[PDB]
PDB file of C-alpha atoms and ligand atoms in Angstrom:
ATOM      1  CA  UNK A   1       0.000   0.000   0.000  1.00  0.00           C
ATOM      2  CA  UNK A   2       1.156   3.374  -0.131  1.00  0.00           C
ATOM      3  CA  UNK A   3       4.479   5.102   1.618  1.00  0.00           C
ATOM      4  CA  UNK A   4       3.188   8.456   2.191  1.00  0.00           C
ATOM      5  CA  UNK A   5      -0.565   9.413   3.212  1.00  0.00           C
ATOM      6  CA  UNK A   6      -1.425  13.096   2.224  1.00  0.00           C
ATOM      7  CA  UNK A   7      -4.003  14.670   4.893  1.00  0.00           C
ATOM      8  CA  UNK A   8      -5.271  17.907   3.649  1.00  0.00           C
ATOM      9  CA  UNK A   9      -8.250  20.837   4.220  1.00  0.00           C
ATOM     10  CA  UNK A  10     -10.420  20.247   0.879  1.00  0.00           C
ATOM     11  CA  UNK A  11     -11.383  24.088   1.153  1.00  0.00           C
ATOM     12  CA  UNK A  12      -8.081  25.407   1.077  1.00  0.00           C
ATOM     13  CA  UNK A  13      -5.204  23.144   0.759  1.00  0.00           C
ATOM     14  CA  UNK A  14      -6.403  21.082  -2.217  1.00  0.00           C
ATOM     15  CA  UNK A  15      -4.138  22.460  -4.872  1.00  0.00           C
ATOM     16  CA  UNK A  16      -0.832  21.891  -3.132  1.00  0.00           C
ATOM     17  CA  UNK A  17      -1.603  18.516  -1.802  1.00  0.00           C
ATOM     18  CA  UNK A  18      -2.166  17.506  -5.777  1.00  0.00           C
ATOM     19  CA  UNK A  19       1.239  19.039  -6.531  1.00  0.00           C
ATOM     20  CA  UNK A  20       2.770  17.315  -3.572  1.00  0.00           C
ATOM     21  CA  UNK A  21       1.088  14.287  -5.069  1.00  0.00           C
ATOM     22  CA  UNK A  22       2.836  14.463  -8.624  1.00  0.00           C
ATOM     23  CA  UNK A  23       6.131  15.601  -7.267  1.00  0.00           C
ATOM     24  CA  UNK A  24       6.451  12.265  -5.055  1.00  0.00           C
ATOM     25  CA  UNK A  25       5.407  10.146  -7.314  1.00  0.00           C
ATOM     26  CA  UNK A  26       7.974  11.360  -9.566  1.00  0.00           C
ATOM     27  CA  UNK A  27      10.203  10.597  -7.191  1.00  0.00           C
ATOM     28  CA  UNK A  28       9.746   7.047  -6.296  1.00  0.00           C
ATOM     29  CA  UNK A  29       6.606   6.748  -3.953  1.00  0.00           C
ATOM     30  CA  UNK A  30       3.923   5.072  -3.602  1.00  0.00           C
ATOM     31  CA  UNK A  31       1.131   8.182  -2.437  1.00  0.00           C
ATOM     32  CA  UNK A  32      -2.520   8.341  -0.434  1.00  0.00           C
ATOM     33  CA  UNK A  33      -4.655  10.730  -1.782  1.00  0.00           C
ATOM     34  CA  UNK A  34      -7.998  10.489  -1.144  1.00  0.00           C
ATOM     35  CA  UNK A  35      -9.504  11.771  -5.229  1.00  0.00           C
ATOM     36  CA  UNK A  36      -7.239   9.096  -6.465  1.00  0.00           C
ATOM     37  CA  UNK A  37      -7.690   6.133  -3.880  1.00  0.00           C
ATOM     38  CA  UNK A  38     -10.164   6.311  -1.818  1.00  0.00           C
ATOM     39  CA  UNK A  39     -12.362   3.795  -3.215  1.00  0.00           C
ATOM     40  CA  UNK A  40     -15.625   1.953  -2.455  1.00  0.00           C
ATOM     41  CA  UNK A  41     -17.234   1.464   0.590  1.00  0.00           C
ATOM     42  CA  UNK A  42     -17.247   2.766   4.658  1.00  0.00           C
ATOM     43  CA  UNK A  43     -14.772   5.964   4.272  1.00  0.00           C
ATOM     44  CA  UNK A  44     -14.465   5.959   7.837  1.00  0.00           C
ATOM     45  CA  UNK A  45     -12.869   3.108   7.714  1.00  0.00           C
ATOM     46  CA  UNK A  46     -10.464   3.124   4.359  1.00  0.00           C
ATOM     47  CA  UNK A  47      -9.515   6.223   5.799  1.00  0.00           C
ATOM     48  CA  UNK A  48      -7.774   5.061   8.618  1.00  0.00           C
ATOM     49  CA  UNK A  49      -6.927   1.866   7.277  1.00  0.00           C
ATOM     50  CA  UNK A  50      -5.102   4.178   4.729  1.00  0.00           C
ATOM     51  CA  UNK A  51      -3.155   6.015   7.359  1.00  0.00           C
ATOM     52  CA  UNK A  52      -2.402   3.359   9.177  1.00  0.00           C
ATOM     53  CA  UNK A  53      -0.202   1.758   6.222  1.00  0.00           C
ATOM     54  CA  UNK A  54       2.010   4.459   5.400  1.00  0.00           C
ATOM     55  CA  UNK A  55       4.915   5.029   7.016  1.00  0.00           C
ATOM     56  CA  UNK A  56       4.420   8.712   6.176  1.00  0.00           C
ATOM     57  CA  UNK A  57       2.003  11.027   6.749  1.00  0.00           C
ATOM     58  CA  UNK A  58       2.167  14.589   4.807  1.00  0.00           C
ATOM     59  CA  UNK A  59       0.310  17.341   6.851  1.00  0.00           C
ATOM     60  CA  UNK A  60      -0.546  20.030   3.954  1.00  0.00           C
ATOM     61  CA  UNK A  61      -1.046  23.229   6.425  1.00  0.00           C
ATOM     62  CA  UNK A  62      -2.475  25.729   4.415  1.00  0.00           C
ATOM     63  CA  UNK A  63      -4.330  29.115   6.148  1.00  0.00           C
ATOM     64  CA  UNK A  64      -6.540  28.377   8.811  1.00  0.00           C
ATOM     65  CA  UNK A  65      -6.510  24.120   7.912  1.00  0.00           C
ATOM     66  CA  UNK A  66      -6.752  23.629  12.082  1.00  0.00           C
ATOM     67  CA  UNK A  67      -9.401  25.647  12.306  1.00  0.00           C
ATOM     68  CA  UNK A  68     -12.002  22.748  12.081  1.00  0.00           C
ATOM     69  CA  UNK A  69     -10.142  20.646  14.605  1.00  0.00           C
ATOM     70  CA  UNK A  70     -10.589  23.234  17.353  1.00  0.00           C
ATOM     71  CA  UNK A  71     -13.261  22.374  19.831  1.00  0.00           C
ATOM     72  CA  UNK A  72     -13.714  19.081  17.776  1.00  0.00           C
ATOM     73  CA  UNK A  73     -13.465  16.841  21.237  1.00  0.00           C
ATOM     74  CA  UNK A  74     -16.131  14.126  19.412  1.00  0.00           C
ATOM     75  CA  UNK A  75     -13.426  13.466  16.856  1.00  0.00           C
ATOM     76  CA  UNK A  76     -15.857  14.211  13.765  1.00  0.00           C
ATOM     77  CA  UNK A  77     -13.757  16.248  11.782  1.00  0.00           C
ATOM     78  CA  UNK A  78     -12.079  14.376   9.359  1.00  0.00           C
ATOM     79  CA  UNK A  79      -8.359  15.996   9.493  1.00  0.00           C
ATOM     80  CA  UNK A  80      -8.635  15.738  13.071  1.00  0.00           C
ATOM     81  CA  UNK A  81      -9.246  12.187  13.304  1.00  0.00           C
ATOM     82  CA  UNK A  82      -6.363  11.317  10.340  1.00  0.00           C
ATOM     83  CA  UNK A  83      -4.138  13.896  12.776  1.00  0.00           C
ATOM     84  CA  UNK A  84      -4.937  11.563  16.269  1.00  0.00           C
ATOM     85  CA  UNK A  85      -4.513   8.239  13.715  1.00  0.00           C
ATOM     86  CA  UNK A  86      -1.103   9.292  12.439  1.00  0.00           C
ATOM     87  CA  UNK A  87       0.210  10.520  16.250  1.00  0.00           C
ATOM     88  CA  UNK A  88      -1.229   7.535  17.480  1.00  0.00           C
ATOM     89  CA  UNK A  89       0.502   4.981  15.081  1.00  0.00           C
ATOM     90  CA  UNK A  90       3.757   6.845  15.429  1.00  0.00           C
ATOM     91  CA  UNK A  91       3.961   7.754  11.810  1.00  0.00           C
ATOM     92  CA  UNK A  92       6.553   9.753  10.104  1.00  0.00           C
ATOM     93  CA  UNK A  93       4.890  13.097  10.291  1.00  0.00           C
ATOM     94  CA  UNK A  94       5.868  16.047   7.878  1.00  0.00           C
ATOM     95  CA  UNK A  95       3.853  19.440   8.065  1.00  0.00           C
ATOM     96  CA  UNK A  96       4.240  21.126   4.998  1.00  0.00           C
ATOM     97  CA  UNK A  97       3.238  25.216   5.828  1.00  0.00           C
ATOM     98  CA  UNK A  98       1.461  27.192   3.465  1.00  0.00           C
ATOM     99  CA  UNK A  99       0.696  30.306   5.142  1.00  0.00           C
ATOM    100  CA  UNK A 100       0.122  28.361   8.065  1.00  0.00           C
ATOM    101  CA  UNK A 101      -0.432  30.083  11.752  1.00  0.00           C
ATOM    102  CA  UNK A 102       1.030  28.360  14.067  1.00  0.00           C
ATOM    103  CA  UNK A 103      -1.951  27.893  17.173  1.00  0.00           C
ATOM    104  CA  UNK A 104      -1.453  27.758  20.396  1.00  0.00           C
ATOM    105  CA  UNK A 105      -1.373  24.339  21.602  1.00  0.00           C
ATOM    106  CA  UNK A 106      -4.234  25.216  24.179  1.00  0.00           C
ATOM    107  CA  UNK A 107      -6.569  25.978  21.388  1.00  0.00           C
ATOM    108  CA  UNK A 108      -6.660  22.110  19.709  1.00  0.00           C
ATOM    109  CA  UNK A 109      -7.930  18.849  21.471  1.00  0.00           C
ATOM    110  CA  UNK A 110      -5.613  17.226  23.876  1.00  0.00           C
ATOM    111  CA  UNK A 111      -5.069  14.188  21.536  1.00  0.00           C
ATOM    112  CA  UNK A 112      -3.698  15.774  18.246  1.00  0.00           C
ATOM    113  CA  UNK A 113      -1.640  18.603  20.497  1.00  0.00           C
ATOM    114  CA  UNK A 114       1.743  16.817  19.635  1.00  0.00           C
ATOM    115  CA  UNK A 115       1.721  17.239  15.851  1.00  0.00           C
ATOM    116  CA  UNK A 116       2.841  21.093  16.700  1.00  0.00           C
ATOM    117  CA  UNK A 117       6.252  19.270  18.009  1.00  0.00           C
ATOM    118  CA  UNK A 118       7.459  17.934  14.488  1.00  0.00           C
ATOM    119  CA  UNK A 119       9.376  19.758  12.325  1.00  0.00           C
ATOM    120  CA  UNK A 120       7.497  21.166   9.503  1.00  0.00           C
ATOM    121  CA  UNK A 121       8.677  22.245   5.883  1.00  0.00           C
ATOM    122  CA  UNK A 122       7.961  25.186   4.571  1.00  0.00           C
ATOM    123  CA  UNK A 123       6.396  25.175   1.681  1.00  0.00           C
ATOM    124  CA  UNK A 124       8.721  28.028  -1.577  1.00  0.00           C
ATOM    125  CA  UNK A 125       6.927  29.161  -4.295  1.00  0.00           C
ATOM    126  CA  UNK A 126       9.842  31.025  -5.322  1.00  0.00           C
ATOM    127  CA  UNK A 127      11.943  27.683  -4.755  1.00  0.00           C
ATOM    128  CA  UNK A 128       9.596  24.617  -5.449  1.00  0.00           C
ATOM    129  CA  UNK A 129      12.361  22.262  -6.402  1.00  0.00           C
ATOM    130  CA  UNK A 130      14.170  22.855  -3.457  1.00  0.00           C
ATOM    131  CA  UNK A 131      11.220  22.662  -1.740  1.00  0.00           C
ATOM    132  CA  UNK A 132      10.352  19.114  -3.173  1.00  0.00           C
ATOM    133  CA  UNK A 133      14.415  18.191  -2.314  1.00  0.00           C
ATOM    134  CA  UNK A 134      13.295  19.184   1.666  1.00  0.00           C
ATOM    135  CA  UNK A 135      10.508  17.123   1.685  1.00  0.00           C
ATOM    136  CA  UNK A 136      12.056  14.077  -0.198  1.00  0.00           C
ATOM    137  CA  UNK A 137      14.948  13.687   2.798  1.00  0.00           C
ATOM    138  CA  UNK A 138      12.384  14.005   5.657  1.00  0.00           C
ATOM    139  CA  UNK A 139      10.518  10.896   4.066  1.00  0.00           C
ATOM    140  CA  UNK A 140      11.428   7.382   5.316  1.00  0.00           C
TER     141      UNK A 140
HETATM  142  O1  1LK B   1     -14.503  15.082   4.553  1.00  0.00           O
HETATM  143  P1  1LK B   1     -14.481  16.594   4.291  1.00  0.00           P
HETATM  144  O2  1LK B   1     -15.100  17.386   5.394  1.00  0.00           O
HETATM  145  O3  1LK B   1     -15.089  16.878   2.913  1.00  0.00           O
HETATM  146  O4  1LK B   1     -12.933  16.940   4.113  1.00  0.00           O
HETATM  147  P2  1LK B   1     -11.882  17.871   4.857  1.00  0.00           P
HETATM  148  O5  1LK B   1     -11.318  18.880   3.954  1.00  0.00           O
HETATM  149  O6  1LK B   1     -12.572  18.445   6.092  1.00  0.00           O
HETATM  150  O7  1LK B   1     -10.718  16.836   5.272  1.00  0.00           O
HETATM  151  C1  1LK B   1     -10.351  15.827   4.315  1.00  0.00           C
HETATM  152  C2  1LK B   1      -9.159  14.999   4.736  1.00  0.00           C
HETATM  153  O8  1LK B   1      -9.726  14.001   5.601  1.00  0.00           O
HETATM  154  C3  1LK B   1      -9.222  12.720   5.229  1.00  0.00           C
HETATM  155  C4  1LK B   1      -8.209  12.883   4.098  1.00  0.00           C
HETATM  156  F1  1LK B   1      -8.357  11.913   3.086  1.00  0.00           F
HETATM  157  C5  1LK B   1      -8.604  14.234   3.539  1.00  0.00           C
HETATM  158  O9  1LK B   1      -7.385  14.809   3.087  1.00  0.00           O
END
């Protein structure tokens, strides 16, 4: 199954996690994203299925993209609940930042407060390539 899982706000963050998409696979791996493999049935349950089996898990952070997860204590939002999977499983976890503000951890449920303590890429338009080259080493 795939190497890298690529969790991303569909509102606002959609773009970039396509081009992170091509670039990997370029590159050699195997990539989660939902338009292109999510597949039939109970999404609740590919979805984490999916995250579970790759050893990476891309975090596209574009504006506002926690903003859902705040006050989400039920779990129901979706990035949330990939977040908590990822943390849980002890994935690889890369935060890509796209004009990202960093929260306070205060503001997010307890359970995905840790995925503000892994070094995140920030994401060039000016130097995509090197960018891409950034991303590439932090994958396992
Ligand atoms: O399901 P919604 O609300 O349409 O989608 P979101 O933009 O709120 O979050 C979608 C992310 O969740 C799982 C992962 F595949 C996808 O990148």
């Amino acid at each position: 199954t795939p190497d890298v899982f690529i969790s991303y706000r569909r509102n606002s963050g959609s773009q970039l996690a396509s081009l992170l998409k091509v670039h990997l696979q370029l590159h050699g791996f195997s990539v989660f994203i939902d338009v292109e493999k999510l597949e039939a049935g109970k999404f609740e349950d590919k979805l984490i299925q999916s995250v579970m089996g790759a050893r990476n898990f891309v975090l596209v952070l574009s504006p506002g993209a926690l903003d859902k997860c705040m006050q989400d204590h039920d779990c129901k939002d979706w990035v949330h609940k990939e977040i908590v999977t990822a943390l849980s499983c002890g994935k690889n976890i890369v935060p890509i930042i796209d004009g990202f503000e960093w929260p306070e951890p205060q503001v997010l449920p307890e359970d995905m407060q840790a995925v503000l303590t892994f070094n995140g890429i920030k994401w060039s338009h000016e130097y995509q390539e090197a960018t891409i080259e950034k991303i590439i080493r932090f994958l396992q």
